[PDB]
Structure 1
Amino acid sequence: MQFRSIIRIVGLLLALFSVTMLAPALVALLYRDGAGVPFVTTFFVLLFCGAMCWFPNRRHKHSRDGFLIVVLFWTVLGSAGSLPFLIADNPNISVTDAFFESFSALTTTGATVIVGLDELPKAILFYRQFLQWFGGMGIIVLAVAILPVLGIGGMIAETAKALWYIYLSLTIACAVAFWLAGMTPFDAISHSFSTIAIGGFSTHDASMGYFDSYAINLITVVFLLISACNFTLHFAAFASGGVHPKYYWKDPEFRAFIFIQVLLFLVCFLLLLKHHSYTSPYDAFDQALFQTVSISTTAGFTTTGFADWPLFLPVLLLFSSFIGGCAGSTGGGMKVIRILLLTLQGARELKRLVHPRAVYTIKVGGSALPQRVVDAVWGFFSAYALVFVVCMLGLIATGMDELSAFSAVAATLNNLGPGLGEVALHFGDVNDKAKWVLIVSMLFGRLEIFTLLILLTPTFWR
């Protein structure tokens, strides 16, 4: 088991985390506004704790450790990252609220409990976005870095830099575009942070409701779609030149993601038209196109409040929230390939009923899927459902009402995280236990459910 070498990496991560507290503390002195005393206190307690772990160890004793690590990287960092939100008495808030905010931030969940953040220090807002960006790194380099410790192909750090480039040249390339449709530079960096990491956080309390310019709506759309799409597939970018074109429409995952996105938009728009929910048949287009992409690709950004929207729409959206993001991107539903495969497998099951003596094979790209991964997919879907209904019960038991707990789980298990059900969205003043529950819910939602579930099987140890 050797947890002794695990702590080395843990402390090393607390220190590596400390050196990112100097980033919104560099905005607590730059932008004259507010208090950055916490960020520099945190940069100290974290560096100290971390180095107090790394130093009494130093042993690179390079499975079950891989798991324990990829639960530590969140459970520890998302706890540590709740430290600025504590000491700072500018948005002075409860400890449980602080944890909710930190975990939701780092997970790229994007569900706030601080109402009235429009008028807060330019640092504590930047910290909020920076967290999302940093976690938005994790969720995609753990689609690479896991392989040595763990298994994706058990069911190379050549690309560790190479991903950070596609990521950086996307957040930058977005920040410019945001500030070209005219946000303040601060608001255009801190919104590219969120829009690339598919997190949902904002500076405005109404998110993408500042300037209803279709410019920014339709920028956020186009950068969400890209960010919501398979960085390993994007990796056909730096390697050779711009020979991107064919690679995308080759992979059937992406090919499916596009059909899904289109169909979803189409029905949404057409219903916003039939119902006369919008004055001009342009705003209908705008709101539909932005909302489907934002809510379904696990983004979270809202540009409306679903006032005239036929109830069928935020519901169908909240459900499509279950499948969002080319696999190995910054999204985090039960990722697109899962649903593709699932539909294939079920279609098969439906075929076997007719001709039962026949040999049917699951086909994705060319080669068939082995009956070890179909099993895994189905098991995953089941587990997913289980987890969802369990946390929904945990919340209804906490005190919350039925529909609200439903929206809550459905929003934290996918990491959306607007209420989205029937206008009961706001987490700030929800029950205190419920907040903890929801934190769990989004840890499950991040870790794809299995890699935490196994942590509490007896079989894991030892």
Structure 2
Amino acid sequence: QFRSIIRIVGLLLALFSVTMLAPALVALLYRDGAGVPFVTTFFVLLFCGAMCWFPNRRHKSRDGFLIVVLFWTVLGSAGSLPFLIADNPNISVTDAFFESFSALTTTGATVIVGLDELPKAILFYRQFLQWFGGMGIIVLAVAILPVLGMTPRIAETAKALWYIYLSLTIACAVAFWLAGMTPFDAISHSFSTIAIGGFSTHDASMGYFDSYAINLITVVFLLISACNFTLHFAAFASGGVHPKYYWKDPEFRAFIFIQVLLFLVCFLLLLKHHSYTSPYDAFDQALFQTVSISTTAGFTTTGFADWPLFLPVLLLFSSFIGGCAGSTGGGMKVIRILLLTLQGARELKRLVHPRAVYTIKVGGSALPQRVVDAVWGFFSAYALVFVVCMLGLIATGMDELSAFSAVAATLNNLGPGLGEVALHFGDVNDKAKWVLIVSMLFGRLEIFTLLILLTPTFW
């Protein structure tokens, strides 16, 4: 049903033009600069939305894929205008599309250096893009269940999620400012610590202030934000119904198991090498770096200077097993890994007792073979996209090991990959920068929503 979509695309980037005012208001609040680009982009986008809101009075499965693909592509290209117009960070069109997509696609990747000495309006709009894509991620993931992903109301949960998503970012900006954080930096870092983005207004994501409390609070609200928000709904609906409503969800149990194991192995390894002089410091930095990278957030508190290269490599692989399915996160949500383990156990039991009926039981209920087949179709598509992205970056002359790290960082919706891409995506080849944008789009779209568009059988 082609040509009935432009109406929504126009109304959507009109909403995004309206979203442009809040950072513009912050620009007029204190005039660091960049006020003109914001207003210019607002008008250009509302005008484009009206041009695309002319085919009206037209409304009638294959369309929804092209809806969400444009909800990320169109909105990223719309968000790529403020960087294009402004003067203080004068960056190429490619770096602008990159920064806009990564801000919106929740991948913490950045291509602008000198964030500290930058107009407070722009580096606010960056965190606001992360917060926006946080809502987009949460709303889309829980409000569209055709691919991957008692039944309550549609809209009442569409607003209960927004209520959790705001009662969290408020309490987190509050705890940050209570820990000695600029209220500006507190809002800008709650926009990005709940959306699991990985962005900061400083070149050192979480090294600008080394307060222990800031690290522990970021860890806490990362664990809170990686958990299935449908499960927080159980803590929201009719108040605090249980404090162990969480522990029933075996996805939560596997998530805490993974986080604790990866933590204590990173801590023991960080002590075998005496990488930090004080174990009270090694504990902090280990827990924070595991919770940051395992949760595909992208925050960094250290430069890996004394760290043995194994620990950053382990964190990159840990990024593969990201957040839970019902929350912001990277690819291969902890539930697909719990399913993989459970199926290995099932196949083991089908060898001792062959003529027995075993079914993949998650939290007491059995799973239809369509879902369990989809989880492994997803593993296959993920792998066969990873390899193509890596070979694409390598083809453009990018460093190979660095290519594999940049791919595993972007397809995982993890902003920083170790290697040549340790703290900036600046000197990356330009074609590799476009292929990287494609990779982050893949990682957000769960490798299926976008690949289908490429398939000939679709068209």
TM range (shorter): over 0.9
Structure 2 SS opposite 1:90: coil
Instruction: Tell me the distance in 2 between the aligned counterparts of 1:9 and 1:144.
Output: 20
Instruction: Tell me the distance in 1 between the aligned counterparts of 2:257 and 2:146.
Output: 34
- The answer to whether the 8 Å contact 1:194/1:200 transfers is yes
- The answer to whether the 8 Å contact 2:148/2:374 transfers is no
Paired position in structure 2 for 1:449: 447
Paired position in structure 2 for 1:377: 375
- The answer to whether the 8 Å contact 1:311/1:422 transfers is no
Paired position in structure 2 for 1:123: 121
- Deviations along 1:108-160, whole A, 9 cap, x unmatched? 00100001111010101001110000000011001233249998999912211
- Deviations along 1:320-358, whole A, 9 cap, x unmatched? 100111112011221110111012223333444555444
* Distance of aligned partners of 1:152 and 1:264 in 2 relative to their CA distance in 1, 3 Å threshold: farther
- The answer to whether the 8 Å contact 2:109/2:414 transfers is yes
* Distance of aligned partners of 1:200 and 1:52 in 2 relative to their CA distance in 1, 3 Å threshold: same
Instruction: Tell me the distance in 1 between the aligned counterparts of 2:391 and 2:156.
Output: 45
Paired position in structure 2 for 1:387: 385
Find runs of 4+ consecutive structure 1 residues off by over 6 angstroms: 148-155
- The answer to whether the 8 Å contact 1:147/1:153 transfers is no
* Distance of aligned partners of 1:368 and 1:151 in 2 relative to their CA distance in 1, 3 Å threshold: closer
Between 1:157-166 and 1:403-412, the stretch displaced more is 157-166
- The answer to whether the 8 Å contact 2:330/2:414 transfers is no
* Distance of aligned partners of 1:240 and 1:424 in 2 relative to their CA distance in 1, 3 Å threshold: closer
Aligned positions of 1:211-222 closer than 5 A: 211-222=209-220
- The answer to whether the 8 Å contact 2:235/2:243 transfers is no
Between 1:207-216 and 1:351-360, the stretch displaced more is 351-360
- The answer to whether the 8 Å contact 2:316/2:408 transfers is yes
* Distance of aligned partners of 1:374 and 1:439 in 2 relative to their CA distance in 1, 3 Å threshold: same
Question: What is the root-mean-square deviation in Å for CA atoms of aligned residues?
Answer: 2.2
Structure 2 SS opposite 1:389: helix
* Distance of aligned partners of 1:281 and 1:148 in 2 relative to their CA distance in 1, 3 Å threshold: closer
* Distance of aligned partners of 1:91 and 1:423 in 2 relative to their CA distance in 1, 3 Å threshold: closer
- Deviations along 1:271-312, whole A, 9 cap, x unmatched? 111211111011100100100000000110000111111221
- The answer to whether the 8 Å contact 1:404/1:424 transfers is no
Structure 2 SS opposite 1:27: helix
Instruction: Tell me the distance in 2 between the aligned counterparts of 1:413 and 1:261.
Output: 21
Instruction: Tell me the distance in 1 between the aligned counterparts of 2:146 and 2:382.
Output: 26
- Deviation for aligned residue 1:57: 1.9
Instruction: Tell me the distance in 2 between the aligned counterparts of 1:415 and 1:217.
Output: 21
- Deviation for aligned residue 1:459: 1.8
- The answer to whether the 8 Å contact 1:113/1:426 transfers is yes
Structure 2 SS opposite 1:208: coil
- The answer to whether the 8 Å contact 2:141/2:149 transfers is no
Structure 2 SS opposite 1:37: helix
- The answer to whether the 8 Å contact 1:71/1:452 transfers is yes
Instruction: Tell me the distance in 2 between the aligned counterparts of 1:90 and 1:192.
Output: 25
Instruction: Tell me the distance in 1 between the aligned counterparts of 2:234 and 2:447.
Output: 30
Instruction: Tell me the distance in 1 between the aligned counterparts of 2:241 and 2:150.
Output: 27
- The answer to whether the 8 Å contact 1:110/1:415 transfers is yes
* Distance of aligned partners of 1:150 and 1:288 in 2 relative to their CA distance in 1, 3 Å threshold: closer
* Equivalent pairs, count: 459
Between 1:355-364 and 1:99-108, the stretch displaced more is 355-364
Structure 1 SS opposite 2:362: coil
- The answer to whether the 8 Å contact 1:4/1:57 transfers is no
* Distance of aligned partners of 1:150 and 1:399 in 2 relative to their CA distance in 1, 3 Å threshold: closer
Paired position in structure 2 for 1:45: 44
* Distance of aligned partners of 1:274 and 1:155 in 2 relative to their CA distance in 1, 3 Å threshold: farther
Structure 2 SS opposite 1:235: helix
* Distance of aligned partners of 1:328 and 1:50 in 2 relative to their CA distance in 1, 3 Å threshold: same
Alignment partner of 1:324 is 2:325 = no
- The answer to whether the 8 Å contact 1:145/1:157 transfers is no
Instruction: Tell me the distance in 2 between the aligned counterparts of 1:148 and 1:49.
Output: 30
* Distance of aligned partners of 1:152 and 1:7 in 2 relative to their CA distance in 1, 3 Å threshold: farther
